[PDB]
Amino acid sequence: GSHMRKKIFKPEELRQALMPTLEALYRQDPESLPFRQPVDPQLLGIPDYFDIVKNPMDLSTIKRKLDTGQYQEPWQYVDDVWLMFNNAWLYNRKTSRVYKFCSKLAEVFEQEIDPVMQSLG
Numbered sequence: 001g002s003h004m005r006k007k008i009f010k011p012e013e014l015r016q017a018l019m020p021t022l023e024a025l026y027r028q029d030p031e032s033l034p035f036r037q038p039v040d041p042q043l044l045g046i047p048d049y050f051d052i053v054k055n056p057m058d059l060s061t062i063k064r065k066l067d068t069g070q071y072q073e074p075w076q077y078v079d080d081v082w083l084m085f086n087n088a089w090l091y092n093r094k095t096s097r098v099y100k101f102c103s104k105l106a107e108v109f110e111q112e113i114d115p116v117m118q119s120l121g
């Protein structure tokens with residue numbers, strides 16, 4: 001639950017650590033919304049979102065990839081939450097809204113995932 005055997009775990013152990021970090025992202029107010037849910041480039045009015053981003057990811061797809069077993073390693077998810085944060089940071093460039101949403105999330109996230117990555121690492 002903090003440090004014992006080899007790093008690599010089961011997506012379940014992960015969730016135990018990771019998910020909580022997610023819920024923290026999820027609890028970051030609408031700042032989370034654009035991630036805890038698929039951007040839906042049709043819903044928001046983006047026809048080329050996947051032309052700006054190469055890997056959009058969404059805490060929905062992440063916490064699901066988390067609830068499905070697509071990590072097997074906590075970092076896997078991390079790259080994905082940093083993914084959705086990265087594409088929000090590149091898509092909206094800077095001085096936007098989701099840039100702010102992604103900023104604090106990266107904060108709580110590193111406030112969760114750091115303690116996570118250490119609980120797992």
Ligand SMILES: Cc1cc(/N=N/c2cc(S(=O)(=O)O)c(C)cc2C)c(N)cc1O
Pocket residue numbers: 030033034035037038039040044046049091092097098
């Ligand atoms: C990529 C992008 C996304 C944007 N908004 N996204 C969302 C907005 C809302 S909300 O209804 O306004 O709260 C919700 C729930 C979810 C999302 C994903 C946006 N405004 C500009 C953008 O360039």
